[PDB]
Design a protein around this ligand. Structure first.
Ligand SMILES: [Zn+2]
Ligand SMILES: [Zn+2]
Lengths: 59, 258, 87, 457, 32, 66
């Protein structure tokens, strides 16, 4: 994907309409089951791939 | 005051994944089985690596770590082995391990794809997944670089290290239509339909069902190749049943000894 | 009461229901194929058989998707890896 | 081939007769019996009589061959059983295409007598089980018995394709298209010799389970090989009857006028030409073709529709007396075929004031599927008056179907308020408000006093 | 090379999609 | 450095799929069909091949000997 700052062909409605073509919630939300009990969480969790960094400050 | 009486319905059965339906059971039972598929079914995996010669571009533990994550064909053998910590042997036994061996030297000019092909087992059954599609790349060697190690595989389960988890991904689901309202949609029509949804394309979620339990748990157990996807299930049921039997034993001791 | 008209004729008409009916092909109780083993006078078992791609397709039961991978989407590029030939 | 040699007593293989001309079948049995010819030439000349397109001489010349079984042929019983195998299989094959002078039992009783004499020399052979299996299709019972006799041909010697094909016709009778489709595959791989276009039965099972891309592809090849087969052409007419706004000329001319001139004794193409002319308002030929589409058919699927076409052509002419009995025969012959005969008797029972039975016959219309036209049938013929919820519940559920949709509703809101006078008094008022204004758009017509009187009531 | 092909055959869509400029979530300055 | 053996998220083996994936990019495929043809259904596993940067190819240029 393309995340250039000042692009304006990119917005959130456009991404959302794409997302909804793959069988996901248009807003990126999902329906999580709780790992302990197995019961659905009553809130729809926002979930998706994000780039994370490990910083040098290890404990 | 007693148990419910569940029914099973296999929907899809391949050599890679299982789709099954469990009916007439508690939400807790249906999820605890999911936990056990992930973390408490035993498999065989590399867990001891003795590195004799390593001249590759990677570290020493990088090699060893990657060897750990390679799945090994476990079905016939894993319910026979001792856990390593339980074998009487002073080192390792064929009753408590399977021995592996990697000896690779790049002599030629082209680069060497160190693959799972190179892992030579002493047991013919507990091999890497090669039987019947490429092979797990371990390293890449250059002209003059080599790798000699011997390795041992032991029994373990995903509660220790992810390496012993037999599954790709367990797809648990219940109540495809929002009949229990376990989840509360702000806009229930923005939501795509479940795979399992017994609903038309008109309405968004099922009407509210006040008095009603979860049943019909939808599973999709996907094997990493270390077991058949249907053996993961029989093993987990047997694992959970065994934890409870053990628990009961310990309980009975506690009761009579008070 | 109101004198509603008795539906003694068809004036909608029922042309929308009679044309949609799929009438089954029952020209012969053996499904238009004679069951016998004496009639086969001629044969096509010899090599370089009389057959067509139109026939070939009919041998399969069901073989005949997600086409949106190859969308333009001017805000989405392709990836780049490690060569050994660059600036 | 076309001129074979006939053995004689002295200097045999010197006489040949040409097979292009049509001789008498009475002198053949004598010329083959005064010279003591071997049994093989009997079947050799029989096949050349069947190659010219003649089904009667092949079965009549082989009838007198039972007498001269083993006179002086020195143990030639094998060719005798092969001769009698044809007299135990072609009788059942010809019983389906009966003429107007013979019945079914007249060819069944001859297929049962000589089959026992055929099993005296060799029993349970490659084709003897074919006769026992196909004996059950002619009477319409014992389907499991015929399938179990067909399976035995795979374990003895399955040296042909039609050796296996018999199980798929029995799988078809139990409404099993998955088991039949799998067996019809084997039919195309070998491409066996059969004038019947073996591909035809394959293309017939491609009709179901939404395989319109497959059935056409089956019919097309069948048309190219032999255009004489109408069973490949009328199917495309039935595959194209759904498109009434598009492709009309091909469906009345290329699929109905061609199949009729090549084979006029077919009740299927006659039924389809009748219903096509019915929309063009030409009733002079619908009743003429439907009488000929009725007397030649035997199974109950075609005859119920042929009577339904006759009563539909009689209903539009204010002729319900003759059409009532045809509508009853359409349901008495074949009831589980389609919903049309139940709806025709429902609109027919309205006559003579016997609208009681129209409700019982219209009840089976909803069991298949509802319709926006069937909802107003029982609503008009509603016998519910007051404190009668066995019949008022159906009128409410029918009125909820006409309320949403707008098929030029004019009196739909009147029947709404005519039920709601006992229930909430605001509902009848809401229906009269809209029913008062819906009677002004078609013409400038004042509201009749009967509606204003009840809305004020 | 296929990213050159991909990016040119894609960005012409901003010239071809002429009928529907309507959607909200984007703005721009218009001074004086 | 080198393609992970398993999808970190789910645990599916992706280690064997990298050569094949580059092979499907020797063919004229979009990455979206390459990932699909290899059978990566989840958006976890699909990230592994999209996002893997192959640095072992660069480390291999630093010969020890010859
Ligand atoms: Zn040991
Ligand atoms: Zn993954």
């Amino acid at each position: 994907g393309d995340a250039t700052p000042f692009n304006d062909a990119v917005n959130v409605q456009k991404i959302s309409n794409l997302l909804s073509d793959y069988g996901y919630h248009l807003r990126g939300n999902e329906v999580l089951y709780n790992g302990f009990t197995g019961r659905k969480i009553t809130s729809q969790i926002f979930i998706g791939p994000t780039y994370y960094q490990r910083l040098k400050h290890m404990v | 005051p007693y148990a419910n009486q569940p029914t099973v319905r296999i929907t899809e059965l391949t050599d890679e994944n299982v789709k099954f339906i469990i009916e007439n059971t508690d939400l807790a039972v249906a999820n605890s089985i999911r936990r056990v598929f992930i973390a408490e079914v035993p498999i065989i995996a590399i867990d001891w690596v003795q590195i004799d010669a390593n001249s590759s571009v990677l570290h020493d533990e990088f090699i060893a770590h990657r060897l750990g994550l390679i799945p090994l064909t476990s079905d016939d053998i894993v319910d026979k082995l001792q856990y390593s910590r339980d074998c009487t042997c002073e080192e390792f036994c064929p009753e408590c391990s399977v021995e592996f061996t990697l000896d690779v030297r790049c002599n030629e000019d082209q680069t060497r794809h160190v693959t799972s092909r190179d892992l030579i087992s002493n047991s013919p059954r507990v091999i890497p997944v090669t039987s019947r599609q490429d092979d797990i790349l371990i390293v890449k060697l250059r002209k003059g670089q080599e790798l000699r190690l011997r390795a041992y595989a032991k029994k373990g389960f995903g509660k220790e290290h992810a390496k012993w988890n037999p599954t790709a991904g367990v797809a648990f689901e219940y109540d495809p239509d929002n009949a229990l309202r376990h989840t509360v949609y702000p806009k229930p029509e923005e939501w795509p339909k479940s795979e399992y949804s017994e609903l038309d394309e008109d309405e968004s979620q099922a009407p509210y069902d006040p008095n009603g339990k979860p049943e019909r748990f939808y599973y999709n157990v996907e094997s990493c190749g270390s077991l058949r996807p249907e053996t993961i299930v029989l093993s987990a049921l047997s694992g959970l049943k065994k934890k409870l039997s053990d628990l009961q034993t310990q309980l009975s001791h506690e009761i009579q000894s008070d | 009461t109101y004198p509603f008209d008795q539906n003694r004729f068809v004036q909608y008409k029922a042309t929308s229901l009679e044309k949609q009916h799929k009438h089954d092909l029952l020209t012969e109780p053996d499904l238009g194929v004679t069951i016998d083993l004496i009639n086969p006078d001629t044969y096509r078992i010899d090599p370089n058989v009389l057959l067509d791609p139109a026939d070939e397709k009919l041998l399969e039961e069901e073989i005949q998707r997600s086409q949106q991978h190859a969308k333009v989407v001017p805000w989405m590029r392709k990836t780049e890896y490690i060569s050994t030939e660059f600036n | 081939r076309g001129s074979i040699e006939i053995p004689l007593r002295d200097t045999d293989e010197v006489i040949e007769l040409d097979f292009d001309q049509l001789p008498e079948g009475d002198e053949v049995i004598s010329i083959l019996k005064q010279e003591h010819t071997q049994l093989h030439i009997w079947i050799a000349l029989a096949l050349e009589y069947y190659k010219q397109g003649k089904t009667e001489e092949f079965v009549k010349l082989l009838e007198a061959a039972r007498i001269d079984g083993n006179l002086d042929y020195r143990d030639h019983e094998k060719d005798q059983m092969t001769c009698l195998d044809t007299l135990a299989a072609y009788y059942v094959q010809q019983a389906r295409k009966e003429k107007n002078k013979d019945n079914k039992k007249d060819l069944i009783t001859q297929a049962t007598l000589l089959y026992t004499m055929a099993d005296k020399i060799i029993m349970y052979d490659q084709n003897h089980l074919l006769g026992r299996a196909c004996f059950c299709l002619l009477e319409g019972d014992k389907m499991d018995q015929a399938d179990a006799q067909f399976h035995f041909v795979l374990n003895q010697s399955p040296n042909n394709i039609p050796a296996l094909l018999g199980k798929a016709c029995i799988s078809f009778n139990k409404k099993d298209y998955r088991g039949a489709l799998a067996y019809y595959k084997k039919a195309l791989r070998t491409n066996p010799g059969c004038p019947a276009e073996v591909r035809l039965g394959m293309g017939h099972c491609f009709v179901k389970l939404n395989k319109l891309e497959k059935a056409r592809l089956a019919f097309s090849r069948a048309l190219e090989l032999n255009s004489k087969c109408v069973g490949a052409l009328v199917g495309l007419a039935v595959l194209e009857l759904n498109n009434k706004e598009a492709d009309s000329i091909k469906n009345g001319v290329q699929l109905l006028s061609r199949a009729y001139t090549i084979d006029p004794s077919n009740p299927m193409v006659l039924n389809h030409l009748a219903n096509h002319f019915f929309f063009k308002k030409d009733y002079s030929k619908v009743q003429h073709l439907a009488l000929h589409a009725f007397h030649n058919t035997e199974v109950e699927a075609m005859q119920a529709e042929s009577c339904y076409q006759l009563a539909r052509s009689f209903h539009v002419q204010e002729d319900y007396d003759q059409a009532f009995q045809y509508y009853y025969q359409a349901t008495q012959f074949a009831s589980s075929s389609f919903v049309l005969p139940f709806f025709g008797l429902g609109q027919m029972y309205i006559y003579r004031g016997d609208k009681e039975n129209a409700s019982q016959c219209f009840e089976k219309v909803l069991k298949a599927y509802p319709n926006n036209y069937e909802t107003m049938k029982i609503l008009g013929s509603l016998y519910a008056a007051s404190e009668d919820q066995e019949k008022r519940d159906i009128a409410k559920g029918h009125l909820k179907k006409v309320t949403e949709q707008y098929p030029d509703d004019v009196e739909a809101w009147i029947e709404l308020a005519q039920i709601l006078e006992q229930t909430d008094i605001q509902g009848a008022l809401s229906a009269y408000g809209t029913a008062t204004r819906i009677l002004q758009e078609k013409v400038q017509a004042d509201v009749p006093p009967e509606i204003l009187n009840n809305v004020g009531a | 090379e296929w990213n050159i092909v991909e990016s040119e055959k894609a960005l012409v869509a901003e010239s071809h999609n002429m009928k529907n400029q309507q959607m909200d979530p984007f703005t721009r300055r218009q001074c004086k | 450095m080198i393609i992970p053996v398993r999808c970190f998220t789910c645990g599916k083996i992706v280690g064997n799929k990298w050569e094949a994936y580059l092979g499907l990019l020797q063919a004229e495929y979009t990455e979206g069909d390459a990932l699909d043809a290899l059978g990566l259904k989840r958006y976890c596993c699909r990230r592994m091949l999209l996002a893997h940067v192959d640095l072992i190819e660069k480390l291999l240029n630093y010969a020890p000997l010859e």
